[PDB]
Amino acid sequence: STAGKVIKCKAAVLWEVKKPFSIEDVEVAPPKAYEVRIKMVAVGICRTDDHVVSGNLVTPLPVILGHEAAGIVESVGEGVTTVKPGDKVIPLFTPQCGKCRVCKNPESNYCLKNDLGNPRGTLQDGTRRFTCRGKPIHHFLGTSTFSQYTVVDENAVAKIDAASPLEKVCLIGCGFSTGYGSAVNVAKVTPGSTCAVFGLGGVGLSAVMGCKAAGAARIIAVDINKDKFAKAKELGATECINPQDYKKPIQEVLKEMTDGGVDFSFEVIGRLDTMMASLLCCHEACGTSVIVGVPPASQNLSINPMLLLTGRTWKGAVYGGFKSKEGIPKLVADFMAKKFSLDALITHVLPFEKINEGFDLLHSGKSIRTVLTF
Amino acid sequence: STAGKVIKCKAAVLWEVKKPFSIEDVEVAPPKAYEVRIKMVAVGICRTDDHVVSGNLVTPLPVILGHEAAGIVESVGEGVTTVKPGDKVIPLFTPQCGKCRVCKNPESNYCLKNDLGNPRGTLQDGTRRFTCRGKPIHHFLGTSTFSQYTVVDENAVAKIDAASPLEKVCLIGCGFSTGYGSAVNVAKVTPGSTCAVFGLGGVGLSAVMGCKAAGAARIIAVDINKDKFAKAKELGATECINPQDYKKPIQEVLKEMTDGGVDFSFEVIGRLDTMMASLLCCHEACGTSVIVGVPPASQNLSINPMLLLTGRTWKGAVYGGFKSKEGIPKLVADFMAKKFSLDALITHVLPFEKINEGFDLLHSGKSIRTVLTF
Ligand SMILES: NC(=O)c1ccc[n+]([C@@H]2O[C@H](COP(=O)([O-])OP(=O)(O)OC[C@H]3O[C@@H](n4cnc5c(N)ncnc54)[C@H](O)[C@@H]3O)[C@@H](O)[C@H]2O)c1
Ligand SMILES: NC(=O)c1ccc[n+]([C@@H]2O[C@H](COP(=O)([O-])OP(=O)(O)OC[C@H]3O[C@@H](n4cnc5c(N)ncnc54)[C@H](O)[C@@H]3O)[C@@H](O)[C@H]2O)c1
Ligand SMILES: [Cl-]
Ligand SMILES: [Zn+2]
Ligand SMILES: [Zn+2]
Ligand SMILES: [Zn+2]
Ligand SMILES: [Zn+2]
């Protein structure tokens, strides 16, 4: 079969920043102990991957990006007990090692074995597994799903329902579990709330579904692209507004609308001005503002600490607050039970070879999520 | 009998910034509808008062400062149903109007009628009640307790216990409520956790007490004044640190000491530099940092949003999140029920006439709380 042998397949490699992806043949070494090689069936295009092309998030190049995916277990290394070949699995971009301080706290999820903070670009043992033209190729968040086969650590992989529709379910890998857990787990939206969500992409639009599920009485959706509004309405927004229509700042407009500010505001975009506008617009004495978007490297916000003393809560979180390995299995089971649907978010399905066409649909706001099939 | 008209008494008026107080004769008009005129037994010098002297906190001048206090009710105005003459009372620096958005929400306590926000220096109906030399004098935070008599709004007064030692219990009116409540209500310190408290003043040592009441397993006290450590220890701090003994930044020292950071950090001082060190030293994936101190007017912090994205919660609160008319009696009842002792915090009891001396003690660092009696 292919077990124990080096595979040679196609993969999209980013050799330089602001350059297109090159689909090239690469060699994928076999799984060492406690690692798993997976065969990718579908991958979503998330904006974090774009942040590396653009140059906003620094990671060592050349690299194979990608992290929102679903596929089948091709082989397991020595010791892997949690999954067997043939199993359907989702690769997780934040490991749940189960043994660190973070993993043992019932409420923390940014495990210490992650590669998000200070990116090495390897797997958890410090070594890479992709070669292309003799050159060693770097990993990304220890998942690198823009390849036909990838090797991930065992604690970064979830085994999900064998009957799962893999080209729907890959969204639970990042975009959806993030969007919805922001509302339900991080901010902890209460029935009757008033919430604002800035940014209506695949992750922003799942924060709307999170608030609706929470029983929020009013969801205001903010975006400069008015074509996203119909979907936001369809998914739960009570109203959608576009900043460019007004002459006064969007935080003043929202305070004027909500009797002095919302109860919960979420920033799902990644830029400084919207994070500030999102703090300023929650109510001064009972609001919580949650940061979900990822900022450009080394950018600072000037905050007036008096903004916090009156009673505000400012906080952020990775992956919607989900412990990755326990969290994702259950969220896929709820999908099966028809507890929530994921169809409205997928607006385009393309073969993996068209990855660049997929990134261009994101750059024009023609797409919410584009799925790439292998 | 005075019930009915103007009283002439002594009060310390501050007519200019950085100029000493002057105990002068002022006239206190009788209480209007829903107001109360109180006879002052004892007042605590809190550092909020000195921020107005210095100019760090602005409010309209001339003014009679003071807010930490207890007295006996002389006459209540028409319509007053909560208190009656002869009752022991504590004026609250933050009203609990019972009817606004904030007041209706079970979490929030910063009532909308407060004068902390934008200071007018009047009572809730827009007018002043004091005169001195043919000129009207302003109120401070609607309480103005550095006067033998003062007039307050009914929703800013609490009826405490008849047998209450008004020279001890006056601390509950600000210092104790603030610091203890921060630990037990805003941060919500968990049994077994590890807290750090920056600032060992009157409010700061009350935070040490709350962290021990919530069950924090390690309470690290930070102060550049070594003479405060003994009391910190006495009250609960498992260890005391002085940032000048180090050649490395205090937040670094602290992370190295706690496996990457503290669970709960508190800044009870008011400098921007220490607010920064208090965010940085709590653990990036599970720590909560709380601002208690009041910052110098109009200064800004430059922070990186990534400090929050990993898992940090940053917040502020006033009155340790206690809702003032209901909370303050509950605490006095627990004091009377021998649940805690306010003894260690009082270090000097001077007669009111020596108020300028009490401010000097503060300014030299020899006092935790100085109580002025009438
Ligand atoms: N914290 C996490 O775990 C986590 C996980 C995944 C993604 N993210 C980050 O969160 C964000 C999610 O974005 P996405 O993946 O859903 O894609 P996205 O690019 O489709 O979302 C951006 C959306 O915000 C809108 N927008 C752009 N500028 C705007 C402005 N000035 N005001 C209002 N709206 C504006 C765009 O029109 C688009 O609708 C990204 O920043 C991604 O980097 C964070
Ligand atoms: N938010 C509120 O509800 C509320 C209520 C009461 C007081 N306060 C504020 O809390 C703060 C302090 O209260 P307090 O009454 O106990 O005052 P305080 O002056 O007695 O306490 C300040 C402490 O900080 C220490 N300190 C000063 N500079 C330091 C530095 N650079 N590093 C470390 N330690 C240093 C001082 O030695 C002193 O012990 C003040 O800012 C007051 O305005 C706020
Ligand atoms: Cl007047
Ligand atoms: Zn993503
Ligand atoms: Zn871990
Ligand atoms: Zn109120
Ligand atoms: Zn005070």
Curated annotation (Swiss-Prot), chains A, B:
Annotated compartments: Cytoplasm
Q: What does this protein do?
A: Catalyzes the NAD-dependent oxidation of all-trans-retinol and its derivatives such as all-trans-4-hydroxyretinol and may participate in retinoid metabolism. In vitro can also catalyze the NADH-dependent reduction of all-trans-retinal and its derivatives such as all-trans-4-oxoretinal. Catalyzes in the oxidative direction with higher efficiency. Has the same affinity for all-trans-4-hydroxyretinol and all-trans-4-oxoretinal.
Gene3D superfamilies attached to this UniProt entry: Medium-chain alcohol dehydrogenases, catalytic domain, NAD(P)-binding Rossmann-like Domain
Where along the sequence do coiled-coil regions lie?
none
Q: What InterPro entries would the database entry show?
A: ADH-like_C, ADH-like_N, ADH_Zn_CS, GroES-like_sf, NAD(P)-bd_dom_sf, PKS_ER
Describe its assembly.
Answer: Dimer of identical or non-identical chains of three types; alpha, beta and gamma.
The alphabetical list of record keywords is: Acetylation, Cytoplasm, Lipid metabolism, Metal-binding, NAD, Oxidoreductase, Phosphoprotein, Zinc
Q: What SUPFAM superfamilies does the entry give?
A: GroES-like (SSF50129), NAD(P)-binding Rossmann-fold domains (SSF51735)
EC number(s): the record gives 1.1.1.105
What organism is recorded for this protein?
Homo sapiens (Human)
Q: What is this protein called?
A: All-trans-retinol dehydrogenase [NAD(+)] ADH1B
Per the entry, which co-factors are needed? Zn(2+)
Pfam families in the record = ADH_N, ADH_zinc_N
Residues holding Zn(2+) 1: 46, 67, 174
**Residue list for modification Phosphoserine:** 22
Other comment: There are 7 different ADH's isozymes in human: three belongs to class-I: alpha, beta, and gamma, one to class-II: pi, one to class-III: chi, one to class-IV: ADH7 and one to class-V: ADH6.
Family from the record: Belongs to the zinc-containing alcohol dehydrogenase family.
Q: How is the cofactor bound?
A: Binds 2 Zn(2+) ions per subunit.
GO MF term (any one): all-trans-retinol dehydrogenase (NAD+) activity
